[PDB]
Amino acid sequence: QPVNQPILAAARSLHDEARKWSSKGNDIIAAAKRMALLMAEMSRLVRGGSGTKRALIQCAKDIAKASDEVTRLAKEVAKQCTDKRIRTNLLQVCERIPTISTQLKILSTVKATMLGTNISDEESEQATEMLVHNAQNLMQSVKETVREAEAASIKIRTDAGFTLRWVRKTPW
Amino acid sequence: NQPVNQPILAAARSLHDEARKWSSKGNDIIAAAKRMALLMAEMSRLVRGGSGTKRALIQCAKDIAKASDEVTRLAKEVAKQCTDKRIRTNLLQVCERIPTISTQLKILSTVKATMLGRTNISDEESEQATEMLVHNAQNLMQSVKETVREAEAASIKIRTGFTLRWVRKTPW
């Protein structure tokens, strides 16, 4: 099936990082895996015709919902982190995502309404490239948030209510 | 009383200040840059404004996009007459970007305009649509400002063809 390759590369990029660890006792890893799977589906949907537009809009809503889970948990990890340098960096990257995923919902709706003529091929190309660049930025930010959440867990001190499990998966 | 979006007006103001340095007499690039700067401030005023002015915002964007095209069209003609490769290529680089930004402006103005009438949409989401419009507005005025500057450099080194008049405005 045809698929928007720039979008697909971004989904695979996050998938590669998230796949390094088990989802078992790690909801950041589970949500990041959901996100990569949904974006990937999205690549197909943007590169599919109208009559599937409702799927494009719902897919962005699902990606935004899964990113809110990543943000919410990464904020809890940060609050339990000893190292100020890591805690601040995690808060910097994590806080930003909600804005990127809000922008994903806007641009998916924009792209979806142009799946149906009157609009120009230029507006259509530009709407795709805006969506592509936003998808890349979102996948990057979550990948960075996975990395820093792992880095921050090493620094947990004393007793913490919001703990996470980082178990590497078997290499081939 | 009417509210305004300060960064859009700041960007509009920035281009007006550059375009105001020269006379519109025999320079349709300075004339179009002047109309663009005037329209951008109006568009910014429109964005802050309530519903019932949405059409005004969509039309304003269309006008900015139309005025931008003339600069791209004229700057391409100035570039073809320019002797220096270094200036000719730099002038083609800046003016190439103008149509894609200007296309993205139309998209994001329509997006912003649709949300004016109803509150179904997230307040934060609306802020995101404004920020996107703001950044895009900033980028467009920057490119046009750079295009007007480089067109002046490309008029100096010319052989034997459209002619641009660069007459500086009187000082106080």
Q: What are phi and psi of B21, to 5 degrees?
A: -60, -30
Q: How was this structure determined?
A: X-ray
Residue of B nearest to A113 (CA): B111
8 Å CB contact of B132 and A103: yes
Q: In whole angstroms, what is the distance from residue B98 CA to residue A88 CA?
A: 38
Residues 6+ apart with CB under 8 A from B110: B58, B61
Q: From the centroid of its chain, how far is CA A19?
A: 14
| Total tally of structural domains belonging to chain B | 1
Instruction: Quote the minimal CA–CA distance from A132 to chain B in Å.
Output: 13
Q: In whole angstroms, what is the distance from residue A20 CA to residue B44 CA?
A: 47
CA A61 vs CA A30, A40, A45: distances in Å: 17, 14, 14
Q: What are phi and psi of B62, to 5 degrees?
A: -60, -40
| Alpha helices (H) along chain A | 5-18, 27-46, 53-78, 84-113, 121-153
The DSSP symbol for B2 reads -
Please check whether residue B137 touches A, CB under 8 A.
Answer: no
Resolution (Å units):
3.4
Q: In whole angstroms, what is the distance from residue B164 CA to residue B167 CA?
A: 10
Domain that holds residue B153: 1-172
Instruction: Quote the minimal CA–CA distance from B73 to chain A in Å.
Output: 17
CA-based max dimension of chain A = 63
* CATH number, domain with residue B36: 1.20.120.230
